[PDB]
Tab-separated table of C-alpha atoms and ligand atoms in Angstrom:
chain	number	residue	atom	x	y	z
A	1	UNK	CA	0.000	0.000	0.000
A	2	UNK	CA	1.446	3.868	-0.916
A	3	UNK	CA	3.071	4.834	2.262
A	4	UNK	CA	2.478	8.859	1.226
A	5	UNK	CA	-0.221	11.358	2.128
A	6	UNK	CA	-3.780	10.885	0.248
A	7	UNK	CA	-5.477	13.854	0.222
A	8	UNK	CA	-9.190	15.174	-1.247
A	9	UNK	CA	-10.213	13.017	-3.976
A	10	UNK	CA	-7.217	10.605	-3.907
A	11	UNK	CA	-8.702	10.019	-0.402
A	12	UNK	CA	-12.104	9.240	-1.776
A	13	UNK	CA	-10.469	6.920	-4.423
A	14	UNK	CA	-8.364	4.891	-2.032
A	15	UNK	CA	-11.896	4.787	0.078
A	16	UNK	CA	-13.516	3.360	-2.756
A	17	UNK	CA	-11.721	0.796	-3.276
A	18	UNK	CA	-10.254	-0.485	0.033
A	19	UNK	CA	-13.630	-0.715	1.118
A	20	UNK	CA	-15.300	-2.338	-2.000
A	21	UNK	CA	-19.306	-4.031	-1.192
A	22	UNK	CA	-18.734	-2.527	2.493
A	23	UNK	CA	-18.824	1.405	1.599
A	24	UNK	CA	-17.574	4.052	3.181
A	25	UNK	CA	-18.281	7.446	4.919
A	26	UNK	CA	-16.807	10.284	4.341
A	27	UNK	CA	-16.347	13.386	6.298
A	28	UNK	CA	-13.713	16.085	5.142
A	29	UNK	CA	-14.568	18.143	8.674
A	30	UNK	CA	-12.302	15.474	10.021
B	1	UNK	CA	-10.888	12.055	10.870
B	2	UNK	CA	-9.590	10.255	8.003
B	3	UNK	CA	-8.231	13.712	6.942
B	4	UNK	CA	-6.119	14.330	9.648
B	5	UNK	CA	-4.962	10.786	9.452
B	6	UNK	CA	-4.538	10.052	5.869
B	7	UNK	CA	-4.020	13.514	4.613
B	8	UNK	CA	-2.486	15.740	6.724
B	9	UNK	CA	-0.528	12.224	7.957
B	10	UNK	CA	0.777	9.174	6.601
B	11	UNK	CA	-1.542	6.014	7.170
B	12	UNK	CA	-1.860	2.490	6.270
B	13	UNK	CA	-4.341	-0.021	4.733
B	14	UNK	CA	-5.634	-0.537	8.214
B	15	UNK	CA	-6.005	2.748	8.536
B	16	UNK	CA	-7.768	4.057	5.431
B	17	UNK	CA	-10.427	0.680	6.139
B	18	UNK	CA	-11.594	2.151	9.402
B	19	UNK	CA	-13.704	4.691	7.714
B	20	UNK	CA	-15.525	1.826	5.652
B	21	UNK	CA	-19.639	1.695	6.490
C	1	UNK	CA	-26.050	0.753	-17.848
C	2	UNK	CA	-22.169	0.442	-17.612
C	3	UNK	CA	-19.740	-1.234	-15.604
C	4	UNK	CA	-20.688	-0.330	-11.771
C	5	UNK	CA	-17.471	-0.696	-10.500
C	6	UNK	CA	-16.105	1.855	-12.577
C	7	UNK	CA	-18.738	4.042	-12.954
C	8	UNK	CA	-18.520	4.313	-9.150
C	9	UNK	CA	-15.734	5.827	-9.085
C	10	UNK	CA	-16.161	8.331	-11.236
C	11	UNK	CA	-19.766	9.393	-8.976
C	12	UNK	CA	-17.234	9.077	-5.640
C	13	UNK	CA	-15.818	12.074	-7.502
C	14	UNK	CA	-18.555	14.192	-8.311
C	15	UNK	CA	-19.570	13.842	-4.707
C	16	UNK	CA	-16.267	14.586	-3.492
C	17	UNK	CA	-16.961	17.585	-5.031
C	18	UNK	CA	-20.592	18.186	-4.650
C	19	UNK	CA	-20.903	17.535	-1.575
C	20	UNK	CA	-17.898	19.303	-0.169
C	21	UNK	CA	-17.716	19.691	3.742
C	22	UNK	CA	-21.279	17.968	4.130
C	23	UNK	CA	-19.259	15.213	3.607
C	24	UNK	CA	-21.829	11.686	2.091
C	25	UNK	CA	-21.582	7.944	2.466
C	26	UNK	CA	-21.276	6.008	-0.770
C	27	UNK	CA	-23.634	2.824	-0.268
C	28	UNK	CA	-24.045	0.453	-3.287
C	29	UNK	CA	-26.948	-1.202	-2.443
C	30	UNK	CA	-28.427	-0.072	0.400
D	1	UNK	CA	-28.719	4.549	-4.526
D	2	UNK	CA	-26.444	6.891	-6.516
D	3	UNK	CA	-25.617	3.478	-8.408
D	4	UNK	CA	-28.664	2.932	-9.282
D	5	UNK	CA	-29.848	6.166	-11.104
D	6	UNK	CA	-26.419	7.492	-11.906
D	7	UNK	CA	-24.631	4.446	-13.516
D	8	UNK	CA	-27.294	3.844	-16.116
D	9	UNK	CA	-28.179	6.943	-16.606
D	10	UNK	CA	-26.283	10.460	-16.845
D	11	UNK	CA	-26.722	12.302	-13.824
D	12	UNK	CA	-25.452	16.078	-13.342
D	13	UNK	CA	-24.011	17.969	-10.148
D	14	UNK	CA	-27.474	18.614	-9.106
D	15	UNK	CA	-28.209	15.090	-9.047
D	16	UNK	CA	-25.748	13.538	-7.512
D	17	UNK	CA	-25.889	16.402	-4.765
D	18	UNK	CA	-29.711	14.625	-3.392
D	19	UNK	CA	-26.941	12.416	-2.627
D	20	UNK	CA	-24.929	14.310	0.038
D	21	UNK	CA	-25.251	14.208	4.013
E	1	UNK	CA	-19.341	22.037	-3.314
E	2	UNK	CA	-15.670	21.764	-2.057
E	3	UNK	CA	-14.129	24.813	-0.339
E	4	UNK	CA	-10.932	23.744	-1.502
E	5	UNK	CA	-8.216	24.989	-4.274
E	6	UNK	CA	-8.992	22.825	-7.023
E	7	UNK	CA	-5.922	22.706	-9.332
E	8	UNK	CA	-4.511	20.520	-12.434
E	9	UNK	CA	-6.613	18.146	-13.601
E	10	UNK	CA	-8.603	18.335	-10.740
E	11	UNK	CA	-10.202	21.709	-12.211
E	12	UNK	CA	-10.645	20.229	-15.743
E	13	UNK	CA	-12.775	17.408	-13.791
E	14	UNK	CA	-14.220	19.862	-11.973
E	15	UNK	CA	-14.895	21.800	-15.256
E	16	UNK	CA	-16.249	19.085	-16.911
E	17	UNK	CA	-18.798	17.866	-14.694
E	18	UNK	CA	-20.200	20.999	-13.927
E	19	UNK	CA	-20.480	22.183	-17.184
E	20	UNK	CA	-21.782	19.242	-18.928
E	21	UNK	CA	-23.653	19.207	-22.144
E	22	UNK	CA	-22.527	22.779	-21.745
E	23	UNK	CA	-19.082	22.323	-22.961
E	24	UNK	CA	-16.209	23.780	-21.494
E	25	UNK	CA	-12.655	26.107	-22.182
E	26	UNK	CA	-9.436	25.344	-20.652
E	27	UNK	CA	-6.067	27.412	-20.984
E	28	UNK	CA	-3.719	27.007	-17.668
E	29	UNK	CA	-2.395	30.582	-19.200
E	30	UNK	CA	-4.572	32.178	-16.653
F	1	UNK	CA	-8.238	32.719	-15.477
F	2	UNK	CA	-9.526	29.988	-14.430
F	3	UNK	CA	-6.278	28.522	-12.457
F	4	UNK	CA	-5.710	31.459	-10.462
F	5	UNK	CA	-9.048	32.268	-9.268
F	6	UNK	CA	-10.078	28.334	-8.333
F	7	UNK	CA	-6.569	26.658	-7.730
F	8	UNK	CA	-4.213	30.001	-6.692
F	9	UNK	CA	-7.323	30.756	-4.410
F	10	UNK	CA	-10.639	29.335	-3.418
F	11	UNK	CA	-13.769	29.510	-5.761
F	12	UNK	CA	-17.306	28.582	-5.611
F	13	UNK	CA	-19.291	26.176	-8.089
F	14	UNK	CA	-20.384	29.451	-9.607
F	15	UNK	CA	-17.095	31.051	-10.191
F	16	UNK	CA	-16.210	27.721	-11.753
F	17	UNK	CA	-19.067	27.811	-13.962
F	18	UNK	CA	-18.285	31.286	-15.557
F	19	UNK	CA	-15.885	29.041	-17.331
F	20	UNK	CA	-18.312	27.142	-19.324
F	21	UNK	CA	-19.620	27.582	-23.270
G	1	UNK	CA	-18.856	2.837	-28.263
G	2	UNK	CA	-18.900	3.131	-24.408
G	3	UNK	CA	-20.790	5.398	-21.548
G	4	UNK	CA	-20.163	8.776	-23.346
G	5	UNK	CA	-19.810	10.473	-20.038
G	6	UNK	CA	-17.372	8.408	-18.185
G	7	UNK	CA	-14.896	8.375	-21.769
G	8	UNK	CA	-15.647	12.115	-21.624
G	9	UNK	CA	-14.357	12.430	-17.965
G	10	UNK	CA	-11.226	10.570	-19.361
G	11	UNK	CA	-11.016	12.593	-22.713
G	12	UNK	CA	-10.680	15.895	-20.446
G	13	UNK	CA	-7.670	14.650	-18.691
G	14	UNK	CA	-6.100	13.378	-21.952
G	15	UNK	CA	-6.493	16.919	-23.334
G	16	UNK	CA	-4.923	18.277	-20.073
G	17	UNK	CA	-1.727	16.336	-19.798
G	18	UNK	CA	-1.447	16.956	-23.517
G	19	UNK	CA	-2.544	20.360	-24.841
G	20	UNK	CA	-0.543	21.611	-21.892
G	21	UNK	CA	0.027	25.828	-21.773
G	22	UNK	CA	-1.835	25.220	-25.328
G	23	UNK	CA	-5.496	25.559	-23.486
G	24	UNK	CA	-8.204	23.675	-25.310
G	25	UNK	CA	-12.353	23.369	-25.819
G	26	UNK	CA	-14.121	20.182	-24.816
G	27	UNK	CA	-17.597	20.771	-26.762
G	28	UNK	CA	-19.411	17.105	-27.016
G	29	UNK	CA	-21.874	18.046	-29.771
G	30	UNK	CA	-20.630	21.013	-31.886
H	1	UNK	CA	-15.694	16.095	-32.243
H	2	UNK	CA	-13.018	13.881	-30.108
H	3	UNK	CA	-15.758	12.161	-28.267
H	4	UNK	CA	-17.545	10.915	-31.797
H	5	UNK	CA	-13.840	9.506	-32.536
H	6	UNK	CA	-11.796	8.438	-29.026
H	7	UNK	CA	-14.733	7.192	-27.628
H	8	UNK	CA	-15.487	4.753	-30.020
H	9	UNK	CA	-12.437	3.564	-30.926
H	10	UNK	CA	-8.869	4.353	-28.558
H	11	UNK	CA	-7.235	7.629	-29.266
H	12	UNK	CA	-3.034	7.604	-28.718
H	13	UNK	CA	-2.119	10.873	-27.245
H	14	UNK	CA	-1.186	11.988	-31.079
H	15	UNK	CA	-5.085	11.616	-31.916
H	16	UNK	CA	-5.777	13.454	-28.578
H	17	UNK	CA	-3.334	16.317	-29.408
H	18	UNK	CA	-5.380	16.911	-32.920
H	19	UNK	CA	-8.036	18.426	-30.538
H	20	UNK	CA	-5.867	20.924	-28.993
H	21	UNK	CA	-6.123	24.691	-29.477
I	1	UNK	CA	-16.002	-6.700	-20.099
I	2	UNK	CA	-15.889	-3.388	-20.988
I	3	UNK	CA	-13.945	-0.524	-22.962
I	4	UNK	CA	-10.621	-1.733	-22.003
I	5	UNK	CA	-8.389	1.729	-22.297
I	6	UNK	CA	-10.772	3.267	-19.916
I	7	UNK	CA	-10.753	0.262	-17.124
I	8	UNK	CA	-6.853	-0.079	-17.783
I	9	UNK	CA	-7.225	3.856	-16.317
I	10	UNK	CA	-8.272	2.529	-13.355
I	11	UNK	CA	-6.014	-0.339	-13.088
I	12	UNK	CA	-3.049	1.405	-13.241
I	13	UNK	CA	-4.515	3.994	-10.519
I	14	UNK	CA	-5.719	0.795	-8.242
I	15	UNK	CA	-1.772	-0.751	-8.756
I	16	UNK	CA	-0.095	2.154	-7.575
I	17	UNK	CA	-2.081	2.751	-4.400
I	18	UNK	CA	-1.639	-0.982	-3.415
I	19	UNK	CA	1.839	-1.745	-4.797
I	20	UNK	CA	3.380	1.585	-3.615
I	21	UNK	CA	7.169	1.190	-3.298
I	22	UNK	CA	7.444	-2.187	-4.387
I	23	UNK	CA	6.139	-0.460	-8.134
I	24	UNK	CA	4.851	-2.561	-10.767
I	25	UNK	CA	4.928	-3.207	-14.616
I	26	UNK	CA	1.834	-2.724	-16.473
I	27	UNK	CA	1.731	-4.752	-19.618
I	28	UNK	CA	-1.809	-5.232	-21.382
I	29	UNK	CA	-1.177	-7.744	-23.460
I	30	UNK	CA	2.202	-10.005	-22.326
J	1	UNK	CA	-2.406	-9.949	-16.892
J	2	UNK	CA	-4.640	-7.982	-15.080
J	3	UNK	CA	-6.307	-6.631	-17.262
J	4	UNK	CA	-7.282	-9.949	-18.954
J	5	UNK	CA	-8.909	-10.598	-15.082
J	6	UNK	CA	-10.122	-7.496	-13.487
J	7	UNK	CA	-11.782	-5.446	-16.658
J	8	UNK	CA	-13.933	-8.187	-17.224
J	9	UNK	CA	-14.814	-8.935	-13.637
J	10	UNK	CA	-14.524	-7.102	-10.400
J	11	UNK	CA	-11.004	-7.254	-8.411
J	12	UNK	CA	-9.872	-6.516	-4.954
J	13	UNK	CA	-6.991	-4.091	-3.734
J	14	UNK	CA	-6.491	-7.927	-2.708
J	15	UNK	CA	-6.521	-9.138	-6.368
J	16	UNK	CA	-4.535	-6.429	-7.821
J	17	UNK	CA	-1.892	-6.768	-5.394
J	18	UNK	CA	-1.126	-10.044	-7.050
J	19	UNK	CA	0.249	-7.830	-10.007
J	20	UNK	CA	2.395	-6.166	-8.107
J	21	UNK	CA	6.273	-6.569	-8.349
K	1	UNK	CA	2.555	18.312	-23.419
K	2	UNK	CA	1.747	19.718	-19.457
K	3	UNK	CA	5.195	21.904	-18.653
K	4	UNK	CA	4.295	21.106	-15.076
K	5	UNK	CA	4.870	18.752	-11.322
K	6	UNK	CA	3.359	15.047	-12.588
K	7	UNK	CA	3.159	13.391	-9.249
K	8	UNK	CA	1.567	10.242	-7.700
K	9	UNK	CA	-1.443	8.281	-9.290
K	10	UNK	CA	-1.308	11.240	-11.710
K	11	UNK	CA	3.138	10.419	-12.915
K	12	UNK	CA	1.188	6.872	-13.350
K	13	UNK	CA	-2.015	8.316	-15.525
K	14	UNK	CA	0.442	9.974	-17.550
K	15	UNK	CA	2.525	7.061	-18.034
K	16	UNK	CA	-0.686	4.924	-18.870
K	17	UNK	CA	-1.304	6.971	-21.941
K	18	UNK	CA	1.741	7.839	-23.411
K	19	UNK	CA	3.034	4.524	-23.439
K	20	UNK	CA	-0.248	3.095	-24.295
K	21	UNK	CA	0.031	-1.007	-26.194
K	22	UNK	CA	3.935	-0.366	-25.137
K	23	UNK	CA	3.236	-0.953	-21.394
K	24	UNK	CA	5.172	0.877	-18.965
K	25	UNK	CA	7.485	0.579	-15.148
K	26	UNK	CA	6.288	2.152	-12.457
K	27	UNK	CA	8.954	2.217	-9.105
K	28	UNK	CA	8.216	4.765	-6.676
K	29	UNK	CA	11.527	4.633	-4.895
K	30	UNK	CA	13.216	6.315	-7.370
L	1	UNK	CA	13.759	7.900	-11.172
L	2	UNK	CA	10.640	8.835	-12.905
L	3	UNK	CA	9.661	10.396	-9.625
L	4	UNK	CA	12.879	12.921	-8.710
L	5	UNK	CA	12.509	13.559	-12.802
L	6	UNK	CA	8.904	14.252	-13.206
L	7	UNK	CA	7.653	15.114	-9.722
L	8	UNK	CA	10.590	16.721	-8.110
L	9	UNK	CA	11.198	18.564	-11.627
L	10	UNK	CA	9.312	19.099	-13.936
L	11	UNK	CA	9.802	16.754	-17.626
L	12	UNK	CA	8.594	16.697	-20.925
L	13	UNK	CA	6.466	13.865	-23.190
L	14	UNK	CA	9.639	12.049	-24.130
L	15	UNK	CA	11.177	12.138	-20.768
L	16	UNK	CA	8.154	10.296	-19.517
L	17	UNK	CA	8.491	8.031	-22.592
L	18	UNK	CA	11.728	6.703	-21.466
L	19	UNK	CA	10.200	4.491	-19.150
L	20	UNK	CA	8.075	3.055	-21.265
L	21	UNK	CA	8.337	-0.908	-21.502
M	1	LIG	CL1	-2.699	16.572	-6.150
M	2	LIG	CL1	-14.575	4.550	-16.888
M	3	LIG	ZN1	-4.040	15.215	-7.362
M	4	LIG	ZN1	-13.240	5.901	-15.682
């Protein structure tokens, strides 16, 4: 896995796909 | 927040899959 | 219809972006 | 869902916004 | 929508989805 | 332009739109 | 032929990473 | 336009370029 | 199946998030 | 490849690892 | 061609398409 | 690397075209 920083959409990516059928939540006031 | 974790820090796998639903 | 895995991505995106500090949850099927 | 009225069909910001928390 | 810089591609996403049908100009000369 | 009004500084889904056909 | 929008999406970033300091139009149906 | 040809069929960069301004 | 250039897209975007520093060749057809 | 297995049917981070080097 | 920083999944984008049927290396640690 | 070449400075279409396969 990229050991570097994921930031605004690149976040949202790596959400999408680590969590796959499960889904996610996603917050950026946090 | 994954923000402050992932962003503004470096995280893991692990990490990143404890904001899943 | 296209593939869903893909397509999701792309509507992570636009709600990335959309939604902004309102943050959303992305839930396939519900 | 979003997947379900934006993957078969085009949907535009406004659309995908009912989406949002 | 995001309160965030967008920049890059990132703003030529951002262009084209909110644009749409609309169409679109692009010049990073400005 | 575009690039220094949304990426140099902050804009709005508006501002972005001025950029449209 | 595929989903029009999502090639689109990927069409804009082409452009980008090519056209460069060139600028360019993305109009779907002149 | 380049979505009536690169969408269809795959556009290298070079085909890409031709739609530059 | 699907358009192939656009899921390779996402491929390539899904290797280097999980790969990071180990890298990884990308060849369509070997 | 991986393209011959995941554009035709859904992979996991888990299955695209596999391609890694 | 961009005259700009190409960094992270977007270094790999850009190495998706211009190296298109030719494949490409991708090693982050270097 | 392609990294200290393209991301640390900035390169040109050919420069990413050396690492091509
Ligand atoms: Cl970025
Ligand atoms: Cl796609
Ligand atoms: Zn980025
Ligand atoms: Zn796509």
């Amino acid at each position: 896995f990229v050991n570097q920083h994921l930031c605004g959409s690149h976040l949202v990516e790596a959400l999408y796909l680590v969590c796959g059928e499960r889904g996610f939540f996603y917050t950026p006031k946090a | 927040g994954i923000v402050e974790q992932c962003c503004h820090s470096i995280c893991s796998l692990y990490q990143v899959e404890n904001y899943c639903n």
